[PDB]
Amino acid sequence: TQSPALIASQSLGRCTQAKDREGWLALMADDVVIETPIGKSVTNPDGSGIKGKEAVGAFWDTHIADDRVTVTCEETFPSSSPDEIAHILVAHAEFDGGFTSEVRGVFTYRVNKAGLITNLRGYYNLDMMTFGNQ
Ligand SMILES: CC(=O)[C@@]1(O)CC[C@H]2[C@@H]3CCC4=CC(=O)CC[C@]4(C)[C@H]3CC[C@@]21C
Numbered sequence: 001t002q003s004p005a006l007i008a009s010q011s012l013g014r015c016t017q018a019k020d021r022e023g024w025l026a027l028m029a030d031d032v033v034i035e036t037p038i039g040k041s042v043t044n045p046d047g048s049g050i051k052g053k054e055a056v057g058a059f060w061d062t063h064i065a066d067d068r069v070t071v072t073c074e075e076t077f078p079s080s081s082p083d084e085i086a087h088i089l090v091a092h093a094e095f096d097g098g099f100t101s102e103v104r105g106v107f108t109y110r111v112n113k114a115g116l117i118t119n120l121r122g123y124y125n126l127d128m129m130t131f132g133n134q
């Protein structure tokens with residue numbers, strides 16, 4: 001048996017690697033809060049996270065859809081709750097014509113009783129990102 005948290009996190013990645021916008025959003029609760037990273041950033045403007053399914057849809061359009069985002073799991077850290085889990089992820093992206101970005105950080109997931117994602121939080125900053133010219 002896979003826990004609702006692990007199923008959710010892995011499903012989110014598969015939908016990302018296939019640019020399935022609708023399937024991606026269906027894995028989330030209507031009150032989902034995405035904080036990638038935690039704190040103020042271009043991917044987290046006010047530093048309190050992207051709140052709501054509409055705003056995460058916009059986030060997908062702005063930062064994932066045409067940016068070739070792919071997430072790779074390096075190590076999984078289960079908790080003693082089936083609804084919360086942590087991963088060491090490596091996120092890669094391609095933008096502005098072919099410029100690349102890559103960062104490795106801790107990502108925590110949380111689902112509600114129905115198993116829908118309510119929280120996704122990333123522990124990383126700019127100094128951890130690496131950029132490319134090909
Ligand atoms: C462009 C960037 O700054 C990043 O590549 C660096 C951090 C990346 C997160 C990592 C976590 C992840 C998990 C998923 O399964 C869905 C997609 C996201 C949210 C993914 C979006 C692109 C981000 C924001």
Ligand code: NA
Nearest residue numbers: 009010013073
């Ligand atoms: Na994943």
